[PDB]
Amino acid sequence: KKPDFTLFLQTLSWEIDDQVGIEVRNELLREVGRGMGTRIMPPPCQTVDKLQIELNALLALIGWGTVTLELLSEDQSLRIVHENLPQVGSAGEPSGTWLAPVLEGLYGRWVTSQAFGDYVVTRDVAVPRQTIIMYMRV
Amino acid sequence: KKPDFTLFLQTLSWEIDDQVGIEVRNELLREVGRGMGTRIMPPPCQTVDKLQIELNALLALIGWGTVTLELLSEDQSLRIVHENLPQVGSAGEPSGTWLAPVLEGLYGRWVTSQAFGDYVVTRDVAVPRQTIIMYMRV
Amino acid sequence: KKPDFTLFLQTLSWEIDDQVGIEVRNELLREVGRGMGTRIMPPPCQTVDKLQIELNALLALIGWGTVTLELLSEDQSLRIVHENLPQVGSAGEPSGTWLAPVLEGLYGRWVTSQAFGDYVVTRDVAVPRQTIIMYMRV
Amino acid sequence: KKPDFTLFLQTLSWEIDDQVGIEVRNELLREVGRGMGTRIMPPPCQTVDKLQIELNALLALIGWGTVTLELLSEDQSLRIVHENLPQVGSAGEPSGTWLAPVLEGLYGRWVTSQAFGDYVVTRDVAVPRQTIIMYMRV
Amino acid sequence: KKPDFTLFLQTLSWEIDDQVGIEVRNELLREVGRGMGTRIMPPPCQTVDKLQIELNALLALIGWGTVTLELLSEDQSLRIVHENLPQVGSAGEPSGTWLAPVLEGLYGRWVTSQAFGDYVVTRDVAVPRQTIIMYMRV
Amino acid sequence: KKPDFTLFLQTLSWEIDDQVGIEVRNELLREVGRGMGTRIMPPPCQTVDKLQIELNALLALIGWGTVTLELLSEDQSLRIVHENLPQVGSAGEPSGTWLAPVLEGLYGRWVTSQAFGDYVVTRDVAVPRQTIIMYMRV
Amino acid sequence: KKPDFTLFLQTLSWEIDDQVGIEVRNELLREVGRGMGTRIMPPPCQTVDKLQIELNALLALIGWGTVTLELLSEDQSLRIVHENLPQVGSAGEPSGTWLAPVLEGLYGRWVTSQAFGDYVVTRDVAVPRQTIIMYMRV
Amino acid sequence: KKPDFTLFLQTLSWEIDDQVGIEVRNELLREVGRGMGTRIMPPPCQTVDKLQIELNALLALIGWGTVTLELLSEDQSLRIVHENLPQVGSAGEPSGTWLAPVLEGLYGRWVTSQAFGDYVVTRDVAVPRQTIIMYMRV
């Protein structure tokens, strides 16, 4: 049987919350996501739709959900909607969204690598519990 | 598709190794294992064989390997052999054995709860890479 | 192949119904559920939403369905709705709901352990066949 | 996810052991196996090898192990060896063999229905833990 | 890998259609279904709902679809609706319904064995392609 | 759930054995195998090793065991060894080998299509029960 | 674990696009599909519905989607709608439809082999991304 | 059902062999492997054992086999043994080893990126059919 890490991640999340706090762990998770973004990378794309397809394939390779990218031309900003985020335990704000900084760092690396190449990710916090909305503005 | 946490655990292990060190993370993993031992517990058993069967069933519930308990009557000690440890990344001493303190804390809780009830676990470090030997002496 | 226990449970349910009756088996199933509640426990939670999120994870660990907790503030009561109950045979009132006292005991243990800690479970009998409604009042 | 009944069967076995005893439950399990033998039946066979093949197919239909029949011509007896019995908990004599009377009743029904048709089952208790040997004598 | 018999059944159906005809094969399939009804039987039930619940479990044991029984009290008839029939090839009237006499014989045996015990099955031929309606009148 | 045809094939084999005999069904199975050989074909190969590699891929596409081809240069004959033949029921000579004429026709078509192109298959009857040996001589 | 060829196909598609162009690869894919159509063929059918059923069974054998055939009697043309095309990378016009000439050649071979036997396939380019419409006119 | 690309790869391999030759396709496959090595990369390692563990994890992520690295200190060379190569068709020298240049380029990229960083891969052609031996010398 393939090992299951859900209970281990729940206990680790509770222990990290009780130990360091709710602000250092965000930076730690962002760094973890940035490091994860180095192992798997998308090919260089020229249009938003191709980038969306490649990122969806990369996410389906590991099964962490689906992504939707939109380009707001009012200020040339990027809106990213992530669906079916994995749920571990009941920690985070709101409860169940504990792996959001990981997505922030991962998407920042993936988009800045190619779209454009000078942006910063800021999480925007009736959407479902597992839906994460982020903005990519210069 | 069920989410896969292997790459996330590898990156997290590397980051934790680079940040805190190789001694604080051992205590953190021991605390994580002790907390994990509270969520699932075996029923109170009277003999070593029944304890072995119950612990094997509990391990197979999550798929973290197999266990073998044997009692040394020379000093009434307990020897625990764990097989098929999950492997994440290449961190630990030796490489690949990163989740050993978790097993130490888990087995300590499981055995001390019931055999006897006053023991301490100390890791004993041509056995395979994924085989861990621990001792339970008063 | 993993063993299948459905036919065995159907035959056992029929035999137990034919032997002891329809009132002793309810107490037996309640005791079985109370004993099951000792093997797996949820972490201590402070709010109803966190309790729901944890109980859903424990239920999904074994695949026995889904739970929904709600609080009536009129008399500070708790309403629990369980969905996708396992079906074995055609025994019970109504037919197919044979494992309801098990849920009663399990939920009583899980909630009383932490919400509050002084409550009793009483089954409330156009809802589907596999949906069970229970009340937790002092 | 398909429901898992392993923990439920372990708790039920412990409760039944603590409630009635270790002799009434044997008769209950024999009756359960006899009732189980009525739901699934093998076709009428004329030779021992065909009976073995049909019983192996029937067992593989549910995944309860493998069977081997051999005829002792000294007293026209039948020896049955069952392998890979399902293991639930740590109850029974020896530990892990809790569903042996079920096999006794099931095999008695299956063979007596057709080989011959006048025999009784008596369990014969360095074989493995999950191997059960039974004898069919008139 | 578990063997696949779909192509073999398609070729066999074509050959049987080309050899004997479209009337002898119906009797052959009815006899095959009647023989199949002996290997697996439902427990004796007293009401229509319990019979439906037991037959649904029996069908799900092999995965041949779902059944729905309803009693017309005008002439004390029984109407059976079968859904999700297996499809092999493109033979039968209409195309794809090649295993209908098997269901006729199987349901006749299953119902007549217990509801009542004196009935005959006659196939009633905007329903989907895989839906079969049968009547059970004395 | 994918439908299971094992019990249906067992009942059909028994009925066909009881109805026509043990010689007409062999011709029927040979014709069925010859028709099956038309749906799936191997690419034209020049050497025996390439033919073996292709035939193994086609067999694994449906999971009907494995094949091994040898060329005896004493009289330019071909020896074919088939392993892991599917087992249905207990019919055939010997018991358990009911789909051997299907293999005869299938291999005849597959080899004669390309090796050479003028041969006839004749079954050669301490090898296991599911191993079939055939010869391909002009 | 069964090998995964998705990333290999993505890289191969990108390299082929960068090397030969966007017109030679179409002929290459058409030839590949025509060669694929030789390995697996449907049985000769007389009506459109039977052809549709057989082609759907053949497609489900490999899992490449679903097909729908409909005959325009105005000019005796055939319209083919293919659903759930496999997606590899982000190449093709539109992005994601890289295996369309393969379907063109495959369907041309399959239909022309039997409906009628003199037709040519021409791709017709608010339908979804993975839906392909083709026409079969003389 | 997840799409299967085995038949497509076999037909594509045959067509590429028939069109360009047996020398241009080697360069094409090497370029494909080099491009594949960019999508997934191992973390920078300092010792051979850690590199072996990381490469094995990366290979198991896609299921393309296992790797074994060993350093000859006579001339500081590196020997790489790959096991369980995927098999498509019967093309290549020897038959079945069609994807060897892909592994050559992939391993060259993976090792040269970090061990050392100045090496070239040259394939060394009673080992099994799917085992490939490569050398990494400056």
TrEMBL record, chains A, B, C, D, E, F, G, H:
Gene3D superfamilies: 1.20.5.3790, 3.30.70.2590. Pfam families: Cellsynth_D. GO terms for biological process: cellulose biosynthetic process. This is Cellulose biosynthesis protein. It comes from Novacetimonas hansenii ATCC 23769. The gene is acsD.
